[PDB]
């Protein structure tokens, strides 16, 4: 289940956890959205070799379920975003937690906030393409997060 969020040239594909049963159709959805990197914010539960053969690299940035990402995760998440946009600005970055409803949309929200959107605008933009995509606790920390244009160039 994909969802393409795009703001100021940056493209995010909020997917769910791919399975070995349907990994082929997951790869085509990535290629259809020009996705080279998949950021996994849940525990690993699928084979990563097949994705690597098709050019899709997988980055593990997991954290506790239903919580807010630690700073080390936020910094690395912004770091990999700045690396991929400079490598190919037309390339989208895929992010997935178990169902693409929690930890993955929160990272996209932080990126949208770092690009100039208020947290309520970022959350609404995500929920416009992904119904029920943030819990109240993760929202309680999105409202306290302070950006500083960490994705300026």
């Amino acid at each position: 289940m994909p969802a393409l969020i795009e703001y100021k040239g940056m493209k995010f594909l909020i997917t769910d956890r791919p399975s070995d049963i349907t990994i082929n159709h997951y790869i085509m959805e990535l290629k259809k959205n020009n996705v080279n990197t998949v950021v996994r914010v849940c525990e690993p539960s699928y084979n990563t070799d097949e994705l690597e053969t098709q050019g899709i690299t997988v980055k593990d940035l997991a954290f506790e379920d239903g919580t807010f990402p630690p700073q080390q995760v936020v910094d690395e998440w912004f770091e990999v975003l700045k690396d991929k946009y400079q490598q190919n600005p037309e390339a989208a970055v895929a992010v997935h937690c178990v169902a693409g409803l929690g930890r993955a949309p929160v990272l996209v929200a932080l990126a949208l906030i770092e690009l100039g959107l208020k947290y309520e605008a970022a959350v609404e933009m995500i929920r416009d393409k992904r119904r029920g995509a943030i819990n109240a606790k993760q929202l309680s920390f999105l409202e306290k997060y302070k950006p500083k244009a960490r994705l300026k160039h």
Binding site: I21, D65, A99, R131
Partner: protein, 155 residues
């Protein structure tokens, strides 16, 4: 059928209903577990369910992961006791989800377009249990379900 009812008029009235009004609830549906083996008893109960598209779940019945088509069973050897997972890993039948408030007219057109197949599963976002919100399947709707709704409603 049903007298060659006007599909245009029938499809218009489908806007007044949603998938939750014609879906088969997950407790009433015939489904297969991913760990099931395709011996003769299993193949027989699939052949006698009358369905051509069998939902396949993993762990919980609500965790639907793929689909089994009767065509996928044509060339299996019931003596081999072939695991259903081995079959599903080969065919990799995709699975598509909609929400309960999805109106039948949009579902009817999406079925006729063939972008998602002819069976759609109905899920909801369960956000009560602490943790990330997760999807929970509650039922399934098919193109045949929409057709008989059109047939049962000729004026």
């Amino acid at each position: 059928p049903l007298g060659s009812v006007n599909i245009i008029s029938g499809a218009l009235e489908l806007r007044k209903k949603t998938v939750a009004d014609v879906m088969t609830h997950i407790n009433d549906a015939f489904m297969l577990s991913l760990d099931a083996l395709l011996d003769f008893e299993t193949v027989s109960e699939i052949m006698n369910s009358g369905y051509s598209r069998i939902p396949v779940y993993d762990g919980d019945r609500k965790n639907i992961v793929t689909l089994l088509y009767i065509k996928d069973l044509a060339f299996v050897d019931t003596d081999d006791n072939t695991p259903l997972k081995t079959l599903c890993e080969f065919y990799q039948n995709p699975v598509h989800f909609v929400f309960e408030d999805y109106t039948l007219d949009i579902m009817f057109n999406q079925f006729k377009e063939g972008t998602i197949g002819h069976i759609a599963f109905v899920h909801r976002v369960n956000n009560e249990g602490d943790g990330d919100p997760f999807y929970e399947t509650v039922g399934l709707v098919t193109l045949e379900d929409v057709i008989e709704e059109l047939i049962q409603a000729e004026i």
